[PDB]
Amino acid sequence: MPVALTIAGSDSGGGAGIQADLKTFSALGVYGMSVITAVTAQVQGVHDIPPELVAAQIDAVFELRVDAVKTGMLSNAEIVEAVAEALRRYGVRPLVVDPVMVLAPDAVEALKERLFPLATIITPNLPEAEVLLGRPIRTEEEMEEAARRLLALGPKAVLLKGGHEEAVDLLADGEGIHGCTLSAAIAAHLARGHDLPEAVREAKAYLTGA
Amino acid sequence: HMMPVALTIAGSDSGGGAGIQADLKTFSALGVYGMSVITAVTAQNTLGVQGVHDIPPELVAAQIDAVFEDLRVDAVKTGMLSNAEIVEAVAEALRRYGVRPLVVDPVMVAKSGDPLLAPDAVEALKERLFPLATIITPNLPEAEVLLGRPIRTEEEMEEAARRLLALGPKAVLLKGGAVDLLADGEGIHRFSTGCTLSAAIAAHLARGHDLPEAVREAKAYLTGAIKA
Ligand SMILES: Cc1ncc(CO)c(N)n1
């Protein structure tokens, strides 16, 4: 019954991609949908899909009613452009933007400018956030500041994922500051009508079982 | 804990009607871990095909290489191959690795009627992939294209089944338009969408079921999915 769309790259050998997204969707009880922006070989080569087709792929997905959208690797600035308008063209939906760098600056400036305001939640991490802010994150106070300054870009929330001394994942929300395929799992709960904090908590708890 | 693994080598139908997306769903529905290689990304609307972008042949092989290095594939499916260079790359890629159950669905035309296989590529499909298939699943139009003769009666279906067997495939499943024929070197059996059935066959083969049963199971799966 729940429907969720992933708009990302394709890695045939497992790992990040529509393949990894769609497995978590049906694993969490969500009817997964997919739109391919690029094709990857696990990295021997990368092939970008033309932006007009990337947009044309999305239109075909909405008749169906999508309950949540996941956004992985958008390799071109023009793909991000076409993606953004495509999501804007249709009705408001919980949108999860996973900013995957690997990184052309031409392209990243379109994530923040064209796509982050659309997001209901972005899930970056330590090195990836540094790309978005140009500043190195060396402290949790800096990590806390980065969650704030990121949230300022438009996303109703920000899950900053910190690997490292010891570090904790931080959820930047309006109420306050509280391998990863979490984005696919977070969007899955959102399709199920869960609110943002329980979607994040149930998603993280879902991964820790493995 | 490693369960059966299957691989689809088809195109992308972002709308989810056909292509690898429908293959993956029948793979997981039948309890098989699904791998996927994209040969081209297509956008299909109710009106027709809004666009096709062929993935480079050099790439498709790399995707296949990525799949078999990671895991052991228990059965393989070829769906849409759009250009002849893909067909050769896919053929050499499957040849490069061990002898598997290979289901070759010769898709040539999308639901709307627009082409999904360049005419120059179908004969490379016959020379390169058909000798590698353990079963090919053509319907009556696709056979009429593979052979040039029209199939208008059940008698002609059995000849087409025999003619197709000569191309290399161990078995041929000819789909009527009102009986289906499973043709083997040992004989013919006549039974009383296409992407789903092909993937379902490969899925049961991926679970180690013998070829005639895998077909009867696949048809039962398809019958269940359509009616209810
Ligand atoms: C990739 C693909 N395979 C099959 C069909 C339908 O035959 C389709 N429309 N697209």
Side-chain angles (χ1 to χ4, degrees), chain A residues 1-41 43-62 66-91 94-137 139-140 142-143 146-163 167-176 178-201 203-210, chain B residues 3-40 42-45 48-68 70-110 112-148 150 152-185 187-228:
Chain A
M1 300 176 187
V3 182
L5 174 61
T6 184
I7 301 167
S10 175
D11 191 359
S12 295
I18 61 166
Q19 298 85 17
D21 295 335
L22 293 177
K23 295 187 190 295
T24 62
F25 286 172
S26 67
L28 293 168
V30 183
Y31 185 77
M33 299 295 288
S34 64
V35 166
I36 291 88
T37 64
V39 179
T40 307
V43 175
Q44 285 76 14
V46 175
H47 189 78
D48 293 333
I49 302 301
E52 71 276 14
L53 182 64
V54 173
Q57 298 185 6
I58 295 170
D59 293 332
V61 175
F62 309 102
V66 170
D67 297 334
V69 175
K70 192 264 186 181
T71 293
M73 184 183 71
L74 311 178
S75 295
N76 302 120
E78 294 179 354
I79 287 174
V80 179
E81 189 78 30
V83 169
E85 178 179 359
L87 279 303
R88 192 184 74 245
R89 192 183 306 170
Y90 301 97
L95 196 169
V96 180
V97 176
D98 194 336
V100 281
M101 305 300 170
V102 64
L103 178 52
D106 309 327
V108 302
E109 299 301 331
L111 284 174
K112 300 187 288 184
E113 190 176 3
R114 300 288 191 269
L115 192 65
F116 282 177
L118 283 298
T120 59
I121 173 153
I122 76 167
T123 69
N125 69 24
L126 183 80
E128 298 182 359
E130 293 176 354
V131 174
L132 295 172
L133 269 61
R135 293 177 180 88
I137 299 168
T139 308
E140 179 170 355
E142 286 176 346
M143 192 184 289
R148 280 180 172 97
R149 306 282 86 85
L150 280 167
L151 202 161
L153 288 171
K156 284 75 179 174
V158 166
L159 202 170
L160 195 64
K161 295 193 261 79
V168 184
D169 299 345
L170 309 184
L171 175 59
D173 193 358
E175 288 173 348
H178 315 293
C180 60
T181 176
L182 290 76
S183 303
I186 296 168
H189 293 286
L190 293 178
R192 294 166 65 189
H194 294 175
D195 285 333
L196 194 68
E198 284 82 7
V200 172
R201 194 269 302 165
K204 291 180 94 291
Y206 175 72
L207 274 72
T208 59
Chain B
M3 46 176 185
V5 174
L7 174 60
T8 185
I9 295 181
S12 173
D13 178 351
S14 298
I20 64 167
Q21 292 85 18
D23 297 335
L24 268 296
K25 293 183 184 294
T26 62
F27 285 169
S28 68
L30 297 170
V32 175
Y33 189 80
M35 302 298 287
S36 65
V37 168
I38 293 89
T39 59
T42 79
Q44 318 195 209
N45 211 234
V49 194
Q50 307 329 321
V52 177
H53 180 74
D54 296 334
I55 301 299
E58 39 210 285
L59 207 179
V60 177
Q63 314 184 17
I64 294 168
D65 295 331
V67 174
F68 293 21
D70 188 358
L71 291 175
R72 172 174 50 83
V73 177
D74 290 327
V76 183
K77 179 186 184 294
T78 67
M80 185 188 77
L81 306 89
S82 181
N83 68 24
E85 295 84 4
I86 287 166
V87 178
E88 291 180 353
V90 171
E92 179 176 359
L94 295 178
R95 296 181 195 270
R96 196 183 306 120
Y97 296 97
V99 180
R100 279 102 171 95
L102 176 58
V103 180
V104 173
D105 192 0
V107 298
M108 296 177 187
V109 164
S112 66
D114 302 337
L116 279 177
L117 177 52
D120 66 7
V122 308
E123 213 282 334
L125 183 66
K126 294 188 284 185
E127 293 183 355
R128 303 295 183 186
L129 280 176
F130 281 182
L132 298 174
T134 62
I135 186 167
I136 67 167
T137 67
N139 57 354
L140 295 182
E142 286 167 357
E144 294 175 354
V145 175
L146 291 172
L147 300 179
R152 296 175 65 86
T153 187
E154 171 169 351
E155 306 185 6
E156 288 174 349
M157 280 193 284
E158 296 185 358
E159 290 180 352
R162 302 186 190 100
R163 287 175 176 173
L164 289 169
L165 284 169
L167 293 175
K170 297 180 177 66
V172 175
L173 182 64
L174 184 61
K175 294 182 282 188
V179 70
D180 293 334
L181 300 177
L182 181 59
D184 192 358
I188 298 170
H189 190 280
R190 61 180 71 98
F191 307 73
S192 295
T193 298
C195 292
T196 300
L197 183 62
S198 299
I201 291 172
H204 295 289
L205 291 174
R207 294 196 285 123
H209 297 178
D210 63 17
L211 181 63
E213 193 181 12
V215 175
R216 289 189 186 273
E217 280 172 342
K219 294 178 98 291
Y221 176 76
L222 185 63
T223 299
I226 293 170
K227 305 292 177 67

